[PDB]
Nucleic acid binder design. Sequence first.
DNA 1: AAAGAT
DNA 2: ATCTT
DNA 3: AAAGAT
DNA 4: ATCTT
Lengths: 244, 244
Amino acid sequence: SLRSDLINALYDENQKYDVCGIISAEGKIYPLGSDTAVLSTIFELFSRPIINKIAEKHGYIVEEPKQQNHYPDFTLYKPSEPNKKIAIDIKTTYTNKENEKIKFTLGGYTSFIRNNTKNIVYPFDQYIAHWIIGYVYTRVATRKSSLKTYNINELNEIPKPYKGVKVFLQDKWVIAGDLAGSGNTTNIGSIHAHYKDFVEGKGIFDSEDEFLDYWRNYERTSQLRNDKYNNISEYRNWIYRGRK
Amino acid sequence: SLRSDLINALYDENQKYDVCGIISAEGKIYPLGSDTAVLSTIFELFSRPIINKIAEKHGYIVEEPKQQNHYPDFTLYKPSEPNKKIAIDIKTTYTNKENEKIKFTLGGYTSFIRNNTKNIVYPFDQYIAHWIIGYVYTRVATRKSSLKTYNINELNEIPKPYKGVKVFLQDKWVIAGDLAGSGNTTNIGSIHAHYKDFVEGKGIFDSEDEFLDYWRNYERTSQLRNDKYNNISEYRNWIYRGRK
DNA sequence: AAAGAT
DNA sequence: ATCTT
DNA sequence: AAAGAT
DNA sequence: ATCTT
Ligand SMILES: [Mn+2]
Ligand SMILES: [Mn+2]
Ligand SMILES: [Mn+2]
Ligand SMILES: [Mn+2]
Ligand SMILES: [Mn+2]
Ligand SMILES: [Mn+2]
């Protein structure tokens, strides 16, 4: 399927290629920086060709946002199924050590999920799936050699500011947690768990509807959430007692 | 000087080289996407070897932040004079049509300008200069050929998601404006002007003391500033009548 | 965690 | 770190 | 703008 | 878009 082929194409591409710099039309190579600002961008770009290849294979049109900061990174669909679109969003995070618990910021909980056409490429109700392709890497620290340029012949000599990169594809609602991923920018935090948990989908919500009801009614601050709900068991009580 | 060779070197690098993609150790190249998320990352990495080379030519040590979310992109100082540090921060913005007035978000007004050691690599009082390396580029819609990968023999035909990139170096305070650059992330907004004004320094503050005093006493919300000041004029009047 | 930093 | 509305 | 989105 | 305190 599209989904099983995508997952496999992403495991293999990440297995076979290591990004090591940005290159210019004249052949000069600039090394990468070590922060997630930089690597977040590199993994999404790395991902574009793979996603397009699989999506065409499965007869799906791929469309990146035409406008800035409009979700999702990739909208796939068949023209014969206009309201059965698939949203795919890239997310990156780092670990200080290999194999420990990781957590992603999954987008706003006050934009399109509370308003059908806010910050989204196509109205929300036209999407049947929302997939997250998550990347995890182990930070490394940039050396003095990351401040020089290189040519196409010194490629394996460029230092990479990461090691142990892992990638997964899973449904947004499945990996969604119950604590905000950011404050002033109101993002849904994902579960905080090991890589296998994301791949396998050991989440906390019972269904995508519970995922949606919970993030749609989550208050922005802690005083406001204080006596409504702050986590899923309190939300389940809240539901139980008549949403009050 | 360091400053003048750097401005010269940034102008020349930008003229001679055109960033067209990210390359892997194995030689495969992934094209660039069109948002400022991809391009501010690309320009910053592009600027790294340049900054470092001119800094070494002048006897300055170059340090990038060791922690994420810390200003500035580069700290330069001569080992003989550690309390004479220079901050160089890269910023990017875009244009829809060549020229057109541009504006930049220039960092928070509530972190290090308000607390000597907050979100800054070295205490604020050890820096005697804060430069802004600013890039502007005209947006260009990405083509379908952006979704294919390339080899080192096709570098000249990889489509670029930009055109007309210009670069300048200028003191932060000279180009600062008097209106917030962002709301929830409380950034100083730069003046809104044409590229030439940035290069030339046609700002609004009379001095760096006034720039600092203004952004240090700037209130976060419209309602709060309304009893104090929402602009440069109101601020001079405020100053005039005894800071009330 | 929040809440507020790049 | 910077953009949209 | 201001305020709040990626 | 994600991270630090
Ligand atoms: Mn993304
Ligand atoms: Mn919109
Ligand atoms: Mn930076
Ligand atoms: Mn920067
Ligand atoms: Mn403008
Ligand atoms: Mn710190």
